[PDB]
Each structure stands twice: as C-alpha cells, then as structure tokens.
C-alpha cells in the first residue's frame, strides 16, 4: 500500500472555521475577510466569532468581554512556578508546563468553550510574568477594567498603553488566531480524537508550535534584521545569503503563492508604532530586505510570510524576542480550541498505520552467544 | 482532495521497529518474537533492542543498565509537585506535567536517546511517589544496585521483591513497550515533525494516551471482574451485559482477529504470581470470563486484548488500578521515542489539509445592526 508521509495531499476534517486562498492571498474567519476584521473588529469580537460561529450583539460582546477579564488571574502555585523558572526556562516549556498545571487543577467536566476562555484569559498573564521576572520587575496584576490587548500591554510595561499601541497589538493577535490545518492544529486534534481533555489538546498544540519547522512561530527574520545592522549592508547580506544557497528568513509559505495577507496588514499597522532610533533602523532594514527579496524570489512564489514583520512588531512593543512563540500561542489557542470543538461534533479516533520494512522471525540468542 | 477522517488505513511512516500480525496473533520487536523476548529477555535488554536496533553484548548491556540506574532520581521541584497533587490530581495529568517539567529542566541539545533514557528511568520514580503518597507512605529512593523492574517494586513496597514478582513485572512492562502506530504514537510524531524536542513529543503522547478511546491504557476489565464478584456469577453477568447492548471489557482489537499475543503471555506469567484470596478470586473470575467470552464473541473475531489481564496483573503486584495508564506510559515511552528517532532520520513536517464547507465573502455587519 502507499506511504502518505507528511499527509500534504490528505484532508483529516471538514471545517467552516478558516478558509485560505493561497492563489489571491486572502484569509477568512467564518466567511469574514481578515482585512475587514483587522479594520473594524477587536480581539474579543473575533474570539467570539471563532468559538460561537457568529458576530456577537452589543449585549453578547459586553458579557463575553467581562467573562474573559474575570478569568485573567492565575493560581499562586502557577505564579510561583513561573517566577522560579522565568530566568532560565525556555518560555514555550514554561507555557507548556503551566497549561498542563491548569488542566490538572480543573477537574470539572465538559464546558470545552469555558475551559478555552480560561486558557485564553490566563496565557497573557503567564507571558507577562515571565517578561517582568526576566527584567527583575514585579508582577503587574491584570486589570479587569481594561480590554484584552490593552491589559496585555499594561501587564508588560506597568503603565496603561496608548490607544494606537493597543490597536497594533489587537490587530497582531487577531492575525494569529487561526490558520486552518498545520502541525499544531493536527497535534490538538489527534489528542482530542481519543476524548482526552481540552487542556491536554492545547498542551500538545504548544509542544508542536515550539518546533522551528512549524512555520509562522519564530523571530528569525528579526535576528536577520539585527545581523544586517545597517540599511546599507542589506544588498551585500541578502546576496551573500542567496548566492550561498542560504535562506532569507520570514520569506516563503506552504500555501500563499503571494504576499501573506497577514504580513500585508502587519506592515500597514506597524506604521502606528512610535519608533526609537533602533526600531526605526530595523524597519528600514526590513523594508529593503522585503524589496530585494520580492525582486529575486517572487518569480518562484516566495514572498514575505507573517513572521517577516510579526517579530519586529512584538519587539517594537517591548516583548523579548524569545517570548514571540508564546505570544503566537496566546492567539492561536482560540483557533486550536475552535477546531477541536468542531471536530468533536462528529468525533473519529485518529489511528493511522505504518508500512513495515524490517526483518521477521529472528532467532533469539542469549547474551553469552553475542560476539564482540 | 481525499477526506480520510481518522486516517484509517493511511500509512504515515515506514518502520522496522514493530510488526503486528493481526491474522495469526503475532508481534515482533526488531524482528524478534514477543514470545521469545517474554521467555528469555528482560526490560533493559528489550529497551536496548528497541532503541539501538540489535541485542546488546554483555558489555553493552552492563553499561546501558548503569545509564538507566543512574538517571532514576527526580528534582526537588518534581517530587514536591507530585507530593502536593498525588491524592487529588488525575495521575495522567500529574505524569503529563512532570515530563513537561523534565523537559524545561534539561536545556541540553540533541542526545534524543539520552533524554529517552532519562524519561524511562524517572517515570517509575514519579509513579511510585504518587502511590506511596496516596497510602500516607514515605518516598522510597531509587536503589541503583537494582534492575529496573526490581527497583520499581522496591519503590512501591519499601522491600526488595521476590525474583518471581520481578519477572512478572519485567514481562508485563516489555509487553507494553511498543505497538506500531496508534493515536499516542501519531501525537508524538506530529510534534517531532516540527523538530520540537523529544520531551515535547512524549508530553503529547501522554496527552493522547490519557483519552479513553486510545486502546490498551485502561482498567475497565478489572472493574468488570470486581463487579462480577464471584466465579459463579460470571455466566449471568456476561450474558446480561451482551443481551443489554453493552460490551465485554478487555475484548476486541482494531488489529488482532485472534487472541492478543500480549494477553496470552500475561495469562501464562500471571500463574507465577503468589496470590492472596482477593487476587485468587479475581483471576478465577477473569479465566471464566475469557472462556465464556471467546465462546460467544470468538467466531466474530472478538478476542481478549492485552488490557483483559494487564490491569489485574498490575493490581496483584500492589498498584492502584487508576495508576495503570501511567504504568502503560512508563513502558510505551520506549516505543514512542524509538518511533520518533526512526522518523527523524528522514524528517517530513506533518501538515494535513481540511475541506472548507463554510461561508465565503460575508459583509462585516456593524454591531449596532446585529439581531
Ligand atoms: O519546499 P520549500 O518550501 O522549502 O521551498 C523550495 C525551495 O524554495 C526556495 N526557498 C523557500 N523558502 C525560501 C526562503 N525563505 N529563502 C530563500 N529561498 C527559499 C529554496 O530554494 C527551497 O529549496 P530548499 O528547501 O532546499 O531551501
Ligand atoms: O461499533 P464499531 O465502531 O463497529 O466497533 P468495532 O468495529 O470494533 O466492532 C463493533 C461491533 O462488534 C461487536 N463488539 C466489538 N467489541 C465488543 C466487545 N468488547 N464486547 C461485545 N461486543 C463487541 C459489537 O457487535 C460491536 O457493535 P456495537 O457494540 O456497536 O453493537
Ligand atoms: O499554517 C501554516 O503553514 C503555518 C502558519 O502559517 C501558521 O501557523 O500561521
Ligand atoms: O495500538 C492500539 O491499537 C492500542 C494498543 O493496544 C496499544 O497501544 O497497545
């Protein structure tokens, strides 16, 4: 029988959650254009749409925003664990462990969406505590009067952010909430398919998202912009990379044959950030890298993906680069839990096989008869 | 493209680790019959075989046994977490968390098999601490002079086991070390395919193994023997279960269309367990349920699986029934990590598709216009 390794040409579910148009560079959440959501929506409204399948009324959104805000606090045992590990732990290992501890401590049955709301609310608190602890700063408690993105920036900086900063983060999070099928969604679904709990599913999603191949989930492009150091070095660096058969970071995608619509929106909204000398210089480098990259690689359907600008935007708003994968998980958890919820409406155990290519019927020999 | 919901009969890798013959009821690890390994081998020698692909020499096995014995200790952070949660937490949630903590505490690069050795050595220390804490008993530290299975029972009981009890645990663990492809192996491989670390892979395996649909990692057959209560009540209990649309627990397999060879080996080795009155009774019940269940369900290719006897065997050696899935994982981590190691020799990112059946091109309706 045929080996289908990678599963690239196999669908494992029907979905109404996300639609990717790789041809035209379009992305839809439940039929709504990502462009319109970036323009007019906000984190809580899109989270509501992804989980409940419709845009909320004024009343539904006010109640929903309150629910999220009163779930933001974390248990003292989780908070102590983060404080203890923040300086030396891989932050994805910290986040993986704390979501595992959340599930251990929540024994209550069913309520998949209630549990997803709890993880979504608490992950920014955990990330903020890692960042603060790393800088020898005291924990800033969540403020239940602030909206999700506003509160996120408050917990990192210890001061209420400008509405323009809130908007850029709010948009960046909306852009990472779902992207249909990929290794991390597949890990959540394989675990859900056994009727394991939703915390187990998310822990598996975080385990997969951590890997460097996952796509989208890194700060390599930003590292590259820092290596280049000056705008005038862009050409020398990019040519010496490509000619040397090396890769331009933040370029390429398995689906978009064009500019990633998420990269396009991040580049536009990145203009609202006030930039010191360092950030101004890094954005000038990124824009030149973008131009020469598209000139050489665009022919072959190799274009900026979301991670070309995402790392630099998060860095610009005051996040350490090695937290970027955790910030990705804080958004994508909505997509993961939405996909599990949809799958479980008609559950099927995911139970593939393997092709055997070894030996059979070998004769067991005791250890005294094994030579050398 | 093709919708293959459940990936039934989709092959996702090539393997030389494990072969299952569902028609004849046979199983092989690296070409060796499970019957021969159960007759003549031991936990460390089979772990060596699964990881390194051949039977070790005396020198290779002495070194490997040391490497395993030297890694059994757990961090103060892990032992304190286990002690805090042993009486309250789901034991698979505790294991999931403590393997996650192992990963966090090990920031070394590469050495997949070294990290597999660390997880395989430490998991029994965690299981034993859960069990001891539940019984208001003091932690028993691993003894590096004892073999894996000897140590395991020592950490549970606080006294060195008999060689007969050691052999039964040794065989029972070997029988769970690998079973080719299933949801837990698949969860491990999906995570490994991104080049995430081997602890991340195993955390995902444990997360999948916890689910009641996984197969093999449950105590439902033992619970059913305990509900039956007397050997005389077997015919009536089973006939009334099967006539009311319910299942005989520990019967049925997606692959074996005969007696699971792991069930046949556990039944034979269970004879060497010295049994108190309860365990004698439960085994009499189990042997009658087997006889009866084969009579009724056999013609339909429904036979005992490994989990018909496994829960009862682990219970008879002094483990609480609800630790059984952790014990399953303590052996199966060898298979998982061996499968990951094999896969990564020619890695391919696992990135399936979905069929979109939803709405497209909807107008964003401003909130003041909604219902
Ligand atoms: O397949 P894949 O998505 O890697 O792309 C095929 C080729 O496109 C080119 N390519 C893909 N992404 C990039 C990138 N970010 N920078 C440069 N070339 C790229 C490479 O030539 C690549 O071959 P490789 O896999 O050996 O690097
Ligand atoms: O149900 P399925 O998804 O068809 O499970 P599977 O394909 O393994 O075989 C199912 C049928 O075999 C029989 N069966 C399978 N396992 C068992 C068992 N452990 N005890 C009794 N009957 C069984 C039943 O007819 C069962 O159908 P039902 O229990 O839904 O009435
Ligand atoms: O889906 C992918 O290929 C990876 C990705 O871009 C994402 O997770 O957003
Ligand atoms: O493989 C399966 O189908 C379940 C099982 O029996 C095992 O994992 O040992």
Residue numbers in the entry:
A (entry chain A): 1 to 372
B (entry chain B): 1 to 371
What does the paper say about this structure?
Citrate synthase of M. sedula (MsCS) catalyzes the first step of the incomplete TCA/glyoxylate cycle in this strain. CSs (EC 2.3.3.1) catalyze conversion of oxaloacetate and acetyl-CoA into citrate and coenzyme A and are well-conserved enzymes in most organisms. The findings reveal that the protein functions as a dimer, similar to other Type-I CSs. The monomeric structure of MsCS consists of seventeen α-helices (α1-α17) and four β-strands (β1-β2), with distinct large domain and small domains.
In order to reveal oxaloacetate binding mode of MsCS, high concentration of oxaloacetate was added to the purified MsCS protein at the crystallization step. MsCS crystals in complex with oxaloacetate were successfully obtained, and we determined its crystal structure at 2.0 Å at pH 7.24 condition. The structural examination revealed two MsCS molecules and two glycerol molecules in the asymmetric unit. The oxaloacetate binding pocket is almost identical with the citrate binding pocket and is formed by two α-helices (α13 and α16) and three loop regions (α8-α9, α10-α11, and α12-α13). In the large domain, Asn182 interacts with the C2 and C3 carboxyl-groups and Arg332 stabilizes the C3 carboxyl-group of oxaloacetate via a salt bridge. In addition, His253 from the small domain interacts with the C3 carbonyl-group and Arg262 is associated with the stabilization of C3 carbonyl- and carboxyl-groups of oxaloacetate through hydrogen bonds. Interestingly, Asn182 is not conserved in other CS proteins, and some other CS structures contain Pro at the corresponding position, indicating that stabilization mode of oxaloacetate might be somewhat different among CSs. However, detailed comparison of the structure of MsCS in complex with oxaloacetate with that in complex with citrate revealed that the conformation of these structures were somewhat different from each other. While Arg351 interacts with the citrate product, this residue does not interact with the oxaloacetate substrate, but rather rotates away from the compound.
